[PDB]
Amino acid sequence: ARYTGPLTKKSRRLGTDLVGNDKSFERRPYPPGVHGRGRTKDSEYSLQLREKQKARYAYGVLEKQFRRYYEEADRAQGKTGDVLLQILESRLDNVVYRAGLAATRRQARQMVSHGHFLVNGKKVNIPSYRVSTHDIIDVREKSKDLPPIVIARETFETRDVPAWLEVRPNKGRILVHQLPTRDQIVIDVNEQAIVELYSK
Amino acid sequence: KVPLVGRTITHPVIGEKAAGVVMLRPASPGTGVIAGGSARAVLECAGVHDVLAKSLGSSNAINVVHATVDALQQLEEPEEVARRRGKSVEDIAPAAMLRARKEADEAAAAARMEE
Amino acid sequence: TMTDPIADMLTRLRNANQAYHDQTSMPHSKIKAGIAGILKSEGYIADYKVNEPKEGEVGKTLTLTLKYGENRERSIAGVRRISKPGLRVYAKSTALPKVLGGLGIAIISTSQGLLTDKQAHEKSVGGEVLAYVW
Amino acid sequence: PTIQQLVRKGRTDKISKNKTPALKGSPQRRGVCTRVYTTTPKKPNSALRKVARVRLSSGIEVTAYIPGVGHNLQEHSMVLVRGGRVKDLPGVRYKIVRGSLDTQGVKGRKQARSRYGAKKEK
Amino acid sequence: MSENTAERTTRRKVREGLVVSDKMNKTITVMVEDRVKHPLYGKVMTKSVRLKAHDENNEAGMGDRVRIMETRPLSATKRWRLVEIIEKAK
Amino acid sequence: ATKIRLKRLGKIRTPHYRVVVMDSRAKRDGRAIEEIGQYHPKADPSVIVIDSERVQYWLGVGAQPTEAVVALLKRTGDWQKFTGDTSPSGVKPQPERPNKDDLFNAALAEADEAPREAITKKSEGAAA
RNA sequence: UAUCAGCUUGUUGGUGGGGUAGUGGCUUACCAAGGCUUUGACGGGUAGCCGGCCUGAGAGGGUGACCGGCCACAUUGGGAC
RNA sequence: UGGUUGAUCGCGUCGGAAGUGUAAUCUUGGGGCUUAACCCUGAGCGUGCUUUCGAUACGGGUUGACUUGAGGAAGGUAGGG
Numbered sequence: 031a032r033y034t035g036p037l038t039k040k041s042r043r044l045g046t047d048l049v050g051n052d053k054s055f056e057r058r059p060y061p062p063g064v065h066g067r068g069r070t071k072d073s074e075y076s077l078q079l080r081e082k083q084k085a086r087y088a089y090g091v092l093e094k095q096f097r098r099y100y101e102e103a104d105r106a107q108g109k110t111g112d113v114l115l116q117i118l119e120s121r122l123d124n125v126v127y128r129a130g131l132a133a134t135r136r137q138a139r140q141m142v143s144h145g146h147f148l149v150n151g152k153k154v155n156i157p158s159y160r161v162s163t164h165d166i167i168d169v170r171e172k173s174k175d176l177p178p179i180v181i182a183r184e185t186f187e188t189r190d191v192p193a194w195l196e197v198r199p200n201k202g203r204i205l206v207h208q209l210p211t212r213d214q215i216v217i218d219v220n221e222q223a224i225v226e227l228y229s230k
Numbered sequence: 231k232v233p234l235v236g237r238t239i240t241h242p243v244i245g246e247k248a249a250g251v252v253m254l255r256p257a258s259p260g261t262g263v264i265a266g267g268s269a270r271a272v273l274e275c276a277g278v279h280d281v282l283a284k285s286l287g288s289s290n291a292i293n294v295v296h297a298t299v300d301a302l303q304q305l306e307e308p309e310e311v312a313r314r315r316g317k318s319v320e321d322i323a324p325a326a327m328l329r330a331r332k333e334a335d336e337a338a339a340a341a342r343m344e345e
Numbered sequence: 346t347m348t349d350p351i352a353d354m355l356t357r358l359r360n361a362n363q364a365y366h367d368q369t370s371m372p373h374s375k376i377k378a379g380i381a382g383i384l385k386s387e388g389y390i391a392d393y394k395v396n397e398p399k400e401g402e403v404g405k406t407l408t409l410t411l412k413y414g415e416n417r418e419r420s421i422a423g424v425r426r427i428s429k430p431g432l433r434v435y436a437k438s439t440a441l442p443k444v445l446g447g448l449g450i451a452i453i454s455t456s457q458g459l460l461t462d463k464q465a466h467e468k469s470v471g472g473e474v475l476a477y478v479w
Numbered sequence: 480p481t482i483q484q485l486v487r488k489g490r491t492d493k494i495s496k497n498k499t500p501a502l503k504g505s506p507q508r509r510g511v512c513t514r515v516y517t518t519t520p521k522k523p524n525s526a527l528r529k530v531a532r533v534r535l536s537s538g539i540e541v542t543a544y545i546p547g548v549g550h551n552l553q554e555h556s557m558v559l560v561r562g563g564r565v566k567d568l569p570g571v572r573y574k575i576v577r578g579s580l581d582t583q584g585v586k587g588r589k590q591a592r593s594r595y596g597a598k599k600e601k
Numbered sequence: 602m603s604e605n606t607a608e609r610t611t612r613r614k615v616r617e618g619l620v621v622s623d624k625m626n627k628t629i630t631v632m633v634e635d636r637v638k639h640p641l642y643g644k645v646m647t648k649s650v651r652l653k654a655h656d657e658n659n660e661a662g663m664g665d666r667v668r669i670m671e672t673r674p675l676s677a678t679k680r681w682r683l684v685e686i687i688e689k690a691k
Numbered sequence: 692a693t694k695i696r697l698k699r700l701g702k703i704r705t706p707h708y709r710v711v712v713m714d715s716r717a718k719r720d721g722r723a724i725e726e727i728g729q730y731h732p733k734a735d736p737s738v739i740v741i742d743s744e745r746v747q748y749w750l751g752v753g754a755q756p757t758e759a760v761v762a763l764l765k766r767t768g769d770w771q772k773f774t775g776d777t778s779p780s781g782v783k784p785q786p787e788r789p790n791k792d793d794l795f796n797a798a799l800a801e802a803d804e805a806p807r808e809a810i811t812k813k814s815e816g817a818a819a
Numbered sequence: 820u821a822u823c824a825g826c827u828u829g830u831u832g833g834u835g836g837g838g839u840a841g842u843g844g845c846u847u848a849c850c851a852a853g854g855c856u857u858u859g860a861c862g863g864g865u866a867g868c869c870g871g872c873c874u875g876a877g878a879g880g881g882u883g884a885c886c887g888g889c890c891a892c893a894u895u896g897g898g899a900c
Numbered sequence: 901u902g903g904u905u906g907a908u909c910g911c912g913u914c915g916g917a918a919g920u921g922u923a924a925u926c927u928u929g930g931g932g933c934u935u936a937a938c939c940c941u942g943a944g945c946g947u948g949c950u951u952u953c954g955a956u957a958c959g960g961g962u963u964g965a966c967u968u969g970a971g972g973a974a975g976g977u978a979g980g981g
């Protein structure tokens with residue numbers, strides 16, 4: 031119920047950097063496997079499916095839960111892709127990643143599932159915990175000196191925190207100013223393509 | 231030219247050339263191009279981003295394309311509707327449609343200035 | 346024999362508009378005169394007139410003069426009969442039809458006389474959906 | 480038709496032909512192999528397709544295909560019969576579920592094993 | 602004088618119809634017609650039902666338009682009573 | 692006899708009762724003549740909402756409460772208004788009150804010791 | 820379902836009695852000849868009904884598990900206490 | 901199924917009001933289970949029905965006109981009917 035295999039293979043297949051940089055993605059222009067350099071047809075399904083899989087492997091969400099997110103966004107009022115990206119960003123592991131306390135979303139999932147975090151006073155070990163507005167995520171007092179935590183404390187200045195979060199790095203406290211908007215989620219997929227895909 | 235009231239069709243239409251009937255309806259923003267392959271390609275090239283298109287009649291690609299084409303040609307832009315009726319857009323056309331046109335135009339203004 | 350004089354009016358108007366005739370004429374009835382009046386007030390025809398019989402000397406004649414814009418352009422994009430004699434259509438104040446996404450007008454006969462949908466909705470009154478002229 | 484015609488006599492749908500009557504509303508049915516043999520396919524095509532006349536527990540006797548390279552079932556072998564048509568075989572509308580009851584999984588399978596009842600090999 | 606909750610309110614069912622059988626004693630079969638939409642095609646149909654009323658004195662004849670009021674079961678099939686005759690077509 | 696009793700609802704190991712009015716013969720979780728209140732005992736200082744006017748009407752018309760409903764009416768004070776008895780009538784204590792906006796505004800500004808204990812944990816990694 | 824067209828004689832109505840918690844051919848005596856039906860009676864087939872469930876843009880189509888309401892039944896048939 | 905029109909009824913039709921449409925489900929707003937499923941709670945829905953008060957354009961009922969549809973009279977008239 032969690033993808034544990036290599037991520038560079040998925041990034042190469044999907045054609046975009048799922049996470050990180052300056053890595054084995056120097057072989058980017060071609061998917062993994064023996065048949066990587068051949069010319070591709072890329073149907074509309076192919077395109078749509080690529081966008082959906084890009085979002086899925088970026089956020090570490092499997093198909094059933096991603097589908098559930100899709101119906102929630104579709105029911106919600108407003109743009110379906112905007113709401114879907116808003117939900118995926120409101121996931122707690124992504125919140126930790128965006129605040130910059132984790133090197134990657136996989137590391138954020140690791141620490142969240144291991145329970146190194148407090149949500150507004152209550153301990154949460156659910157990576158899919160949907161953080162609500164005005165929430166206060168806190169690092170567990172016992173685990174305020176994790177090696178990944180201190181690496182993040184050394185590196186966060188380079189990292190860019192989105193406008194909808196406030197982070198007290200050394201304190202391990204992520205204040206949620208508001209639930210993010212499409213202009214605030216970084217554009218790296220085609221949510222419109224995903225929405226069109228979930229209609230066929 | 232195709233009249234778009236803010237990234238979507240102005241009003242529902244039904245076009246038909248030979249035997250290729252294509253139905254088009256406007257959709258709320260974010261709905262996407264819910265259309266079959268040929269009609270969807272026609273709409274995506276025309277620039278419509280929120281539309282519901284159904285293909286009635288024959289499924290031949292050429293005829294379906296012509297039906298989508300004359301369905302779009304049947305579109306009647308609100309200002310020219312007002313000219314037709316000898317009235318004003320505020321007197322003939324829905325306030326929600328006109329408003330959505332203003333927000334589309336202004337968001338367009340934002341994008342242009344940002345360039 | 347004649348069954349729906351309202352449908353006869355609508356088809357006469359449609360055929361004349363298609364053939365680019367400037368005027369069309371028909372036997373007069375009160376409901377036909379009302380529909381012609383609201384068509385004129387909504388701008389789908391140039392004008393209308395009820396004439397006392399002088400050729401057949403039998404009954405009043407309703408005559409509609411149509412309008413074509415610059416470069417001979419139709420002012421009527423179509424007209425359709427809804428409440429047929431075979432099957433009659435009645436709409437409530439909440440389920441009032443929308444024509445051409447609101448650009449066209451449905452003609453509804455309400456208890457307060459002939460009223461275009463927009464009007465009816467404002468008065469929260471329904472009735473018989475006569476036509477969908479757009 | 481006119482509205483009055485529709486009122487007097489309404490629309491009637493089609494019959495919606497059934498495909499596997501012998502199963503009698505069951506996903507698969509148990510049967511006994513009353514005959515095991517081979518049949519030539521229709522044309523085009525050419526082979527020795529392995530089939531069996533089976534008396535299913537519904538009391539109906541039908542011809543069932545035996546998929547996979549390999550075959551052990553014989554006279555009076557208890558089998559499970561599921562739906563499934565063999566296109567180049569007139570009169571065959573059922574297949575025998577490998578790996579269930581007397582019939583056993585295809586010997587040298589390593590791909591699509593579950594469809595032929597082959598247990599995973601260490 | 603001071604009777605109990607008067608009015609009784611509780612009013613009974615009333616039907617206007619046409620007499621189609623008067624040839625049994627103290628009984629008239631009334632045909633009552635109602636107009637309803639067709640459930641699927643929306644046309645306004647005409648639904649007709651035969652109601653047996655109780656006509657004391659046999660005051661109504663064939664083709665008479667009558668008014669009946671529902672009552673308690675007066676026989677195996679009679680459940681209505683004649684209250685007036687509206688048109689005596691004769 | 693007409694009873695005022697509890698109709699069980701909710702999950703396994705999480706009961707929420709509806710104080711309802713129905714006759715004795717009816718099954719426990721069935722159609723009720725009227726729903727009067729609710730009773731959540733799983734929650735802190737159990738929630739007890741009872742419609743005073745309706746419960747007074749049903750007591751005065753002769754509905755017989757179950758012992759549980761008698762306890763709830765004692766706590767709501769209805770069992771004293773009807774069948775006047777000297778009982779404490781301990782109207783439910785509230786199950787306290789949290790808040791979110793005030794805490795967020797308190798911490799947004801908290802700043803100071805937020806990043807301050809934060810550089811103290813910097814000294815901690817030093818100690819780490 | 821018309822490749823089922825006639826069905827019914829306590830049957831339809833009336834009066835008196837009886838009976839019942841109660842109206843009533845519910846029952847009885849007498850009198851009358853009605854009652855239902857091509858807008859489908861009678862017969863055959865299938866079926867517990869519904870709140871709902873699934874699907875569907877909707878209209879509809881399929882369905883009647885859990886849960887809830889009504890009904891029917893308790894080895895088969897009948898009967899009362 | 902219904903040409904033109906006067907009057908009237910207010911059955912269809914339309915608009916209010918009251919009653920009803922249990923609960924659960926369902927839609928939606930809040931709340932609780934570490935999240936979710938799930939659960940609680942407010943509202944909507946419950947597409948109808950009954951009662952009642954209005955409106956009268958249209959459909960229909962009742963009733964009276966009109967002649968243009970339809971039929972008839974008189975005269976004219978063609979034809980392997």
Ligand SMILES: [Mg+2]
Binds near residue numbers: 248249
């Ligand atoms: Mg065609």
Ligand SMILES: [Mg+2]
């Ligand atoms: Mg008697």
Ligand SMILES: [Mg+2]
Binds near residue numbers: 866
């Ligand atoms: Mg059965």
Ligand SMILES: [Mg+2]
């Ligand atoms: Mg059913």
Ligand SMILES: [Mg+2]
């Ligand atoms: Mg049950």
Ligand SMILES: [Mg+2]
Binds near residue numbers: 902
């Ligand atoms: Mg008429």
Ligand SMILES: [Mg+2]
């Ligand atoms: Mg009139």
Ligand SMILES: [Mg+2]
């Ligand atoms: Mg609820």
Ligand SMILES: [Mg+2]
């Ligand atoms: Mg919660």
Ligand SMILES: [Mg+2]
């Ligand atoms: Mg309900």
Ligand SMILES: [Mg+2]
Binds near residue numbers: 960
């Ligand atoms: Mg009339």
Ligand SMILES: [Mg+2]
């Ligand atoms: Mg002659």
